[PDB]
Amino acid sequence: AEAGITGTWYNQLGSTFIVTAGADGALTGTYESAVGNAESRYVLTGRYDSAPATDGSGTALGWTVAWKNNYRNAHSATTWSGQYVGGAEARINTQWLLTSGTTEANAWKSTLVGHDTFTKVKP
Amino acid sequence: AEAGITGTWYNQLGSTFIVTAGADGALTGTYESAVGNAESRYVLTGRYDSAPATDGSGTALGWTVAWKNNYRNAHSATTWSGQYVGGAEARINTQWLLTSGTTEANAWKSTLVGHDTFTKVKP
Amino acid sequence: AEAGITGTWYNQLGSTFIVTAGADGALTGTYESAVGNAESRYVLTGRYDSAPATDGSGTALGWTVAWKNNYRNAHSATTWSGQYVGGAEARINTQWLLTSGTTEANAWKSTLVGHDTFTKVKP
Amino acid sequence: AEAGITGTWYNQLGSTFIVTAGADGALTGTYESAVGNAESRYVLTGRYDSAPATDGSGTALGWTVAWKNNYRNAHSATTWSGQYVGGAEARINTQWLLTSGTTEANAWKSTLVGHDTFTKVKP
Numbered sequence: 387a388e389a390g391i392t393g394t395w396y397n398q399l400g401s402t403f404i405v406t407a408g409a410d411g412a413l414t415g416t417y418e419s420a421v422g423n424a425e426s427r428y429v430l431t432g433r434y435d436s437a438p439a440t441d442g443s444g445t446a447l448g449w450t451v452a453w454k455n456n457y458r459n460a461h462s463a464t465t466w467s468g469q470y471v472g473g474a475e476a477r478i479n480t481q482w483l484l485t486s487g488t489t490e491a492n493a494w495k496s497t498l499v500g501h502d503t504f505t506k507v508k509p
Numbered sequence: 510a511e512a513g514i515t516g517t518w519y520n521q522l523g524s525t526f527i528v529t530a531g532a533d534g535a536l537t538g539t540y541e542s543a544v545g546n547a548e549s550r551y552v553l554t555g556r557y558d559s560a561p562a563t564d565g566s567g568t569a570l571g572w573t574v575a576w577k578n579n580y581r582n583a584h585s586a587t588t589w590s591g592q593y594v595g596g597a598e599a600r601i602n603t604q605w606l607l608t609s610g611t612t613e614a615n616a617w618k619s620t621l622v623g624h625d626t627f628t629k630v631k632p
Numbered sequence: 633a634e635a636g637i638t639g640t641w642y643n644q645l646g647s648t649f650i651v652t653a654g655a656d657g658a659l660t661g662t663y664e665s666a667v668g669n670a671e672s673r674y675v676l677t678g679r680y681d682s683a684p685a686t687d688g689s690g691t692a693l694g695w696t697v698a699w700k701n702n703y704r705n706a707h708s709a710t711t712w713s714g715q716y717v718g719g720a721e722a723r724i725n726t727q728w729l730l731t732s733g734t735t736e737a738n739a740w741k742s743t744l745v746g747h748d749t750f751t752k753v754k755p
Numbered sequence: 756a757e758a759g760i761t762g763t764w765y766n767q768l769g770s771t772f773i774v775t776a777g778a779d780g781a782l783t784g785t786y787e788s789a790v791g792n793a794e795s796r797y798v799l800t801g802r803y804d805s806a807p808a809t810d811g812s813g814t815a816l817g818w819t820v821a822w823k824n825n826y827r828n829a830h831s832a833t834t835w836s837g838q839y840v841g842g843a844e845a846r847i848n849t850q851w852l853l854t855s856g857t858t859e860a861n862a863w864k865s866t867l868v869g870h871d872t873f874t875k876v877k878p
C-alpha cells in the first residue's frame with residue numbers, strides 16, 4: 387500500500403492520475419482526463435486505510451475530483467471508492483459516483499455510477 | 510456554497526461532520542460516527558465545484574473518510590458524492606460507496622451503496 | 633411478505649405501482665409514472681425471496697420496468713433492488729439503477745443510480 | 756436485440772444464464788451460479804426496451820433473481836441493469852444491486868453494488 391500506491395496510474399479509457407500516498411492516510415495528486423467533459427488536470431484528494439494484511443486483502447481507499455480547473459467548470463464531482471492490490475500486476479479496482487449540480491426537480495437524475503480499473507502500465 | 514457549506518452537518522442516523530470549504534474547492538474536516546464499525550472521529554477530505562448558478566442548482570461535491578483512527582481500523586473507506594442546496598433548509602444530499610479491503614475472491618462483495626442526507630439542524 | 637406485498641404502493645415523487653406477489657416468488661404488475669420521461673403505465677416483473685424471518689428482517693425483492701409502452705419508448709430500463717418491511721407502516725426501501733441504451737462511446741454515462749421508498753399510503 | 760439476446764450467456768466469474776426474450780419485451784430464463792451463496796439454478800425474469808436504433812446504441816434491459824430455490828434460500832435478491840450490444844462480439848454490460856433482508860438497524864449495509872459483463876462464449 388502507500389509506497390506501492392504512489393505513482394502514475396492509467397485506466398482503460400485512457401485517464402491518468404498521479405498520486406502521493408502520505409504516511410497518515412492522505413492521498414494527494416492530479417487527475418488528467420482522456421475521454422469526458424473534462425479538459426486537462428484537476429486536483430484530487432482522498433484517503434486510504436495506512437495500516438491495511440496477513441491474508442493478502444486489498445487496501446481500501448477513495449478520492450474525489452471536482453471538475454473545475456482554469457479551462458473548464460463542469461459543475462460536477464466524482465468520487466472513486468475501491469481497493470489497491472499490489473504485486474506484479476498491481477491495480478486499483480473502483481466503482482465511482484459522478485454527481486452534477488441540478489435544480490431540485492432533476493435531482494433524481496443527478497448521479498451516474500460506473501467502475502474503473504487502474505494499472506501502472508497503460509493499460 | 511463554500512461559506513454555506515462550512516459548519517456542522519448531521520444526518521438521520523446521527524452521524525456528524527464538521528467541514529471547512531476552502532476558497533479553491535477544498536473540503537477538510539472530521540466525521541464523528543453515530544451508528545457503524547467506527548468509533549470517534551476520522552479525518553475527511555474532499556472537493557466541491559467553488560464556482561457553482563443562475564438557476565438555483567445544487568453545488569456538486571464529494572469527500573472520503575478511511576475508517577482508521579487511533580482507536581479503530583475497520584480496513585474500509587467511504588466516499589460520498591452529492592450536492593449542496595442552500596437556503597432556509599439547506600442540505601447535502603448524497604449517495605455513498607463503502608469499500609472494505611478483501612482477498613481477490615471476495616472482491617465482488619466488497620462495496621456497499623447507500624444514501625445520506627445532511628442538515629444543519631439535527632435532524 | 634407476499635400477501636403484505638400485494639397491493640398499491642406510492643413513493644415520494646408520486647409514482648405508483650400495483651403488484652401481485654405470487655406463491656412462488658413472482659412479482660407482476662404495472663408501474664404508472666408521476667415525474668420522468670415516462671407517460672402512463674408500464675409492465676413490471678420481478679421476484680421476491682417467498683420464504684423470508686424469526687428476527688423481523690425485511691423481505692428482499694427486485695423488479696424491472698423497460699420504459700416502452702404504446703405512447704412512449706424512452707430506450708431505457710430501471711431495476712429496483714430492496715426489501716419489504718411490513719407492519720403498521722409497511723414500506724419497501726429500494727435503491728435503483730436506470731440504464732439508457734448508448735453508443736459504445738457513451739456507455740460510461742449510461743447508468744443513473746438513486747433510491748425510492750414506497751408506502752401503502754400516498755405518501 | 757430480442758433474437759440476439761435469446762441464448763446462453765456467461766460472465767467472467769463463471770456464472771451462466773439462459774434467457775428467452777419475448778416479442779413484447781419480456782425476458783424469462785434461469786441463472787445458474789458459479790461463485791456465491793447460491794447453489795444451482797434460479798428463476799430470472801426481466802424486461803428489455805423491444806424497439807431499440809439507427810445509431811448502433813445498446814438495447815437497455817434488466818432482470819431479477821431472488822436467491823431462493825429448492826436447495827438454498829439466501830434471503831437476498833439481485834437486479835442487473837445494463838444494455839445489450841450485438842455483433843461479432845455481442846455482450847451485455849451491466850451494473851448490479853444485491854440486497855439482503857436485514858433488521859431495520861442493519862438496513863444501511865444491506866445492498867452491494869458491482870458490475871458483470873456477459874458474453875456468448877465463455878468467457
Ligand SMILES: N=C1N[C@H]2[C@H](CS[C@H]2CCCCC(=O)O)N1
Nearest residue numbers: 401422423424453460462464482
Ligand atoms: N475515468 C473516468 N472518467 C469518467 C468516469 C468517471 S469520472 C468521468 C469523467 C467526468 C468528466 C467531467 C464531466 O463530464 O462532468 N471514469
Ligand SMILES: N=C1N[C@H]2[C@H](CS[C@H]2CCCCC(=O)O)N1
Nearest residue numbers: 524545546547576583585587605
Ligand atoms: N453516515 C453513514 N454511516 C454509514 C453509512 C456510510 S459510511 C457508514 C459507517 C461506516 C463505519 C465504518 C465501517 O463500518 O466499516 N452512512
Ligand SMILES: N=C1N[C@H]2[C@H](CS[C@H]2CCCCC(=O)O)N1
Nearest residue numbers: 647668669670699706708710728
Ligand atoms: N420512481 C422513480 N422514477 C424515476 C426514478 C427511477 S426510474 C425513473 C423514471 C424513469 C422514466 C423513464 C426515463 O426517463 O427514461 N424513480
Ligand SMILES: N=C1N[C@H]2[C@H](CS[C@H]2CCCCC(=O)O)N1
Nearest residue numbers: 770791792793822829831833851
Ligand atoms: N454473477 C454474479 N454473481 C454475484 C454477483 C451479483 S449476484 C452474486 C451471487 C449472489 C449469490 C447469492 C448470495 O450470495 O446471496 N454477480
